[PDB]
Amino acid sequence: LRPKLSEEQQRIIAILLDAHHKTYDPTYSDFCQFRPPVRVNDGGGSVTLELSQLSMLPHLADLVSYSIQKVIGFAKMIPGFRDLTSEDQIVLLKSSAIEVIMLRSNESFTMDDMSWTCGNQDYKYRVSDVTKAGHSLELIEPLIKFQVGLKKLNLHEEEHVLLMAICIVSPDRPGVQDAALIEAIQDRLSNTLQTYIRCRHPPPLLYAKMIQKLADLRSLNEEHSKQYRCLSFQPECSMKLTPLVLEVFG
Numbered sequence: 628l629r630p631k632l633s634e635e636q637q638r639i640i641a642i643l644l645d646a647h648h649k650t651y652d653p654t655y656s657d658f659c660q661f662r663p664p665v666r667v668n669d670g671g672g673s674v675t676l677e678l679s680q681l682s683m684l685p686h687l688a689d690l691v692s693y694s695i696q697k698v699i700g701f702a703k704m705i706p707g708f709r710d711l712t713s714e715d716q717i718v719l720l721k722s723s724a725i726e727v728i729m730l731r732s733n734e735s736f737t738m739d740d741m742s743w744t745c746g747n748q749d750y751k752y753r754v755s756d757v758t759k760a761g762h763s764l765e766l767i768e769p770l771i772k773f774q775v776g777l778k779k780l781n782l783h784e785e786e787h788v789l790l791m792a793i794c795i796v797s798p799d800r801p802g803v804q805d806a807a808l809i810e811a812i813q814d815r816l817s818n819t820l821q822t823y824i825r826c827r828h829p830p831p832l833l834y835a836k837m838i839q840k841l842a843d844l845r846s847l848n849e850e851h852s853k854q855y856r857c858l859s860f861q862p863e864c865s866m867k868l869t870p871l872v873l874e875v876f877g
């Protein structure tokens with residue numbers, strides 16, 4: 628059966644699309660305001676050298692911090708998100724931050740050269756830039772695999788916004804209080820998405836593929852958390868980060 632989207636489901640989709648349009652700049656026009664990218668000689672991808680310099684860390688920390696601010700703004704517009712306690716809203720934001728950043732980075736990701744192209748050559752990011760921020764291949768290899776698999780789904784904007792909202796409103800995050808209310812908000816979003824796909828997505832298992840991307844995000848989140856811990860041991864690393872990054876990942 629292919630039930631039609633309800634008036635409420637149409638309203639939810641319109642709300643999420645508007646929220647995304649207000650919180651995502653597809654021209655990357657604020658990027659010149661971040662601390663500048665610095666790319667030094669590291670053809671060998673030396674862990675010792677990367678940790679010694681962390682040349683791309685100030686720029687990428689400013690990028691992630693900016694992205695987290697946008698995610699906070701988007702989440703506030705998710706129907707039902709405001710119905711949660713302020714404590715649950717924060718737990719959900721902090722626990723999903725890196726996964727939602729990964730999902731939103733997909734819009735600038737291009738399979739032309741496997742880079743995140745955000746304007747000029749200064750704002751063109753590759754695997755090499757992430758290693759220059761002190762990350763290792765255990766995170767980068769699955770991260771690129773994820774970006775390509777997600778890109779190949781050719782998601783409609785409606786599906787992309789629902790996916791981010793479902794990611795944020797997850798009842799299975801550690802420390803949440805009202806898991807049942809979080810689950811009812813997520814179910815309302817998940818049903819909207821399932822109905823949308825059957826009703827609007829032409830042929831040529833998309834919902835199952837999108838669910839699998841959410842599980843892939845969980846693994847990437849865990850690996851990112853391990854790597855952030857290593858990075859946090861580097862003397863003077865805090866100056867290269869931001870207060871928001873320090874709170875979210877600390």
Ligand SMILES: CCC(CC)(c1ccc(OCCCCC(=O)O)c(C)c1)c1ccc(OC[C@H](O)C(C)(C)C)c(C)c1
Pocket residue numbers: 650651652687688689690691693694695697728729731732735743745752753756757760762855858872876
């Ligand atoms: C450069 C690649 C990538 C990929 C997800 C990234 C993130 C956001 C992003 O843009 C999203 C769109 C911009 C605006 C928006 O959200 O409206 C783009 C275009 C690239 C990244 C950036 C920093 C990273 O490491 C961060 C590091 O671990 C700290 C947490 C220590 C700083 C990692 C692992 C990946």
